[model samples]
Target: MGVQVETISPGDGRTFPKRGQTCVVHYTGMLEDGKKFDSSRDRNKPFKFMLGKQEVIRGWEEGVAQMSVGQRAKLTISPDYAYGATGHPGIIPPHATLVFDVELLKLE
Candidate 1:
C-alpha cells in the first residue's frame, strides 16, 4: 500500500506549516508485520511536538495535517520517509516500515 491517507476532516496539507506548532497526539506505533513497537496511548500521555522543530519523524509533518481535534487516523509511512534509510540501531532497524495509529487532541 502506497500511503493511503484517509483524511477524516477538512484539512489542506500545504497550509499547515511544519513550524513551532504544538500538538497533543495519542499514538500506537508498530511495524509492518503488525508487531507492537511503541505507543504513547498505552502510557496514558499524548506525545507533544513542535512541528518542524525536528522533534519527530518526517512522516509526522505529513500526518499532522490530516488530523483535527478529537480525530483519529492510521498512517503507513515508508521507511525512507520515516526514520530514513538507515533506521536508528536498536531502536528501529534499517529499512523497517512503521505504522502509527494516532489521535489528535490539540493543535496550536
Candidate 2:
C-alpha cells in the first residue's frame, strides 16, 4: 500500500495515536475525480476507531497513525491501500485512488 500524507495543521499535543489507542476524527473522502464519497461531518459526529485494529481501510490505519490529537491532514492513498480492485461496489470504484481530508479530534 502506498500512502502520502500532508499535514495541514499539526496538533498541539506531543504524543500521537498508537496501536490500541482509540481516536475520534472528522473526515471527508473523495475519489480521484474529486467526487465526494463519504464524510463524517455530514452526520455531525466524529468517527471513532482503534489504531491498527483493521476497523478501517489500510490507508486510514497508516495515515492516522502519524497524526497527533487536533491535527489536520490530507491523505492520498493508492488503490492498494484503499478498496483496491474489488472496491466497495456502489460506494467506490474498482482500483480507485482515494483522497481524504482528515482532522484528529480526540484520543483516548
Per TM-score, the best of the predicted structures is 2
Estimate candidate 1's alpha-carbon lDDT, on a 0 to 1 scale.
0.73
| Highest lDDT against the true fold, candidate | 2
TM-score, candidate number 2: 0.95
Cα distance off (Å), candidate 2, residue 52: 1.2
lDDT of each: 0.73, 0.92
lDDT digits (tens) for residues 10-104 of candidate 2: 89758799889998999999999999999999999999999988999899999888888899999999999999899999999999999999999
Question: TM-score of each candidate?
Answer: 0.80, 0.95
In model 2, the runs with Cα more than 4 Å from the true position are none
Q: RMSD in angstroms, all models?
A: 3.4, 1.1
Tell me how far the alpha carbon of residue 106 in candidate 2 is from the true structure, in angstroms, after superposition: 1.1
Put down candidate 1 lDDT per residue, 1-108, tens digits, no spaces.
234445544433334434677888888888888888889978888898887776777787777665666666788888866876688888788887788887777776
